[PDB]
């Protein structure tokens, strides 16, 4: 599915992302916009043989297992296929692990380049 902006903000808040590990909700909504354009089924292949999966573009080298990535570590202990559900539970639960690993939201390239440093609370305004 393709979420609306406020629709995803409300779902992300129900799943505990607002202020999680120091990151207000607007960070997570901005990240999803620029990572996946709010589509739970987005996928993107990378030069190292990994693929990024779902609404938050979670990577198959470090975080989820897709069975075809060399050097897999599966640190979220989840098949990547579950991250293409229209229900965001599995993606959120893995995102919480990623953002707790010691480098904040810098795991999300689109967030680092296109959200960080902007007024991210604009992404929840009006919701």
Output phi, psi for 51, to 5 deg. -135, 145
Residues 74, 81, 85, 93: which binds Cl ion (CB under 5 A)? 81
State the CB neighbour count (10 A cutoff) for residue 40.
21
Residues 12, 58, 80, 110: which binds Cl ion (CB under 5 A)? 80
Between 52 and 66, name the residue whose CB sits nearer to Cl ion.
Answer: 66
What strands lie across the sheet with 51-53, from one edge to the other? 43-45, 51-53, 58-59
If binding means CB under 5 A, how many residues of this protein chain bind Cl ion?
4
Per CB under 5 A, 66 contacts Cl ion: yes
Helix (H, G, I), strand (E, B) or coil at 43: strand
Active centre residues (catalytic): 35, 52
Per CB under 5 A, 49 contacts Cl ion: no
Per CB under 5 A, 43 contacts Cl ion: no
> Sign of the CA dihedral 20, 22, 26, 30?
negative
Binding positions are 101
* Binding site residue list for substrate: 101
**Interacting residues with Cl ion (CB under 5 A):** 66, 79-81
């Amino acid at each position: 599915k393709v979420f609306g902006r406020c629709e995803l903000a409300a779902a992300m808040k129900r799943h505990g992302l607002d202020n999680y590990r120091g990151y207000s909700l607007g960070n997570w909504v901005c990240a999803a916009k620029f990572e996946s354009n709010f589509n739970t089924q987005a996928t993107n292949r990378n030069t190292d043989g990994s693929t990024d999966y779902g609404i938050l573009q979670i990577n198959s080298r470090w975080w989820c297992n897709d069975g075809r990535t060399p050097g897999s570590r599966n640190l979220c202990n989840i098949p990547c296929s579950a991250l293409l559900s229209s229900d965001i539970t599995a993606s959120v639960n893995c995102a919480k692990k990623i953002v707790s690993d010691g480098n904040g939201m810098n795991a999300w390239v689109a967030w680092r380049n296109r959200c960080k440093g902007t007024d991210v609370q604009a992404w929840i305004r009006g919701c």
